[PDB]
Design a protein around this ligand. Structure first.
Ligand SMILES: CC(C)[C@@H](Nc1ncnc2[nH]ccc12)C(N)=O
Length: 164
C-alpha cells in the first residue's frame, strides 16, 4: 500500500513525508523508530511517533527497559506498533553529538534485514547529528529487504535524490 515513492535501487524507495503520517495512512507491518538506548522518546522521529500513540509507546518502552535494561548502540528491539503499525522496530543508530562511533551505523541498519518490508527514517540523521547523505549510502549498501524511507525535510529530500 506504499504510494508516491521514488525508486532508488532494487530494494530502496524514498518519499518526502512525515513518517508518522505515512504510518497512519499505510499501517505497515513494521515502522522503524530512531531510538536511543533508554527508549526515551523525546523528540525527532521518536518523540513524534510516541505522541501519535498517545504516549502508549513510552509506557510500553519503560516496561521493556525495566525488564531488560538498555539497548546497545547499533542494536534493536521489536515492540508493538500501537495504532501506527503491527510492530515498531526500535533501532539505535550512533549519536555523533555524544561521540559514538559512526561505524556502528552499518550495524544499526543490519537490523532491517530481519524484516521483509519496513517503513523507516534515515538513521543517525536529524537530531542524531550524522550526515544524511552518508546515512542513505550506508542504508543502500547494507539493507537487502524492502525499505520505504520517509524524509521529512523537503530541502534535504531534494539534495538526497540529486546527489544519489
Ligand atoms: C531523520 C531526519 C533526516 C528527518 N526526520 C524525520 N523524517 C521523517 N519523519 C519524521 N518525523 C519526525 C521527524 C522525522 C528529517 N528531519 O527530515
Amino acid at each position: 500500500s506504499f504510494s508516491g515513492y521514488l525508486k532508488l535501487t532494487d530494494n530502496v524507495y524514498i518519499k518526502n513525508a512525515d513518517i508518522v503520517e505515512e504510518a497512519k495512512k499505510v499501517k505497515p507491518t513494521v515502522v522503524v523508530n530512531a531510538a536511543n538506548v533508554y527508549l526515551k522518546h523525546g523528540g525527532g522521529v521518536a518523540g513524534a511517533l510516541n505522541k501519535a500513540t498517545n504516549n502508549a509507546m513510552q509506557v510500553e518502552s519503560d516496561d521493556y527497559i525495566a525488564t531488560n535494561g538498555p539497548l546497545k548502540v547499533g542494536g534493536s528491539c521489536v515492540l508493538s506498533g500501537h495504532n501506527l503499525a503491527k510492530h515498531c522496530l526500535h533501532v539505535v543508530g550512533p549519536n555523533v553529538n555524544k561521540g559514538e562511533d559512526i561505524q556502528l551505523l552499518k550495524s544499526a541498519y543490519e537490523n532491517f534485514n530481519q524484516h521483509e518490508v519496513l517503513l523507516a527514517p534515515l538513521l543517525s540523521a536529524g537530531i542524531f547529528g550524522a550526515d544524511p547523505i552518508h546515512s542513505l549510502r550506508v542504508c543502500v549498501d547494507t539493507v537487502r529487504t524492502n525499505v520505504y524511507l520517509a524524509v521529512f525535510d523537503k530541502n534535504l529530500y531534494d539534495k538526497l535524490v540529486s546527489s544519489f
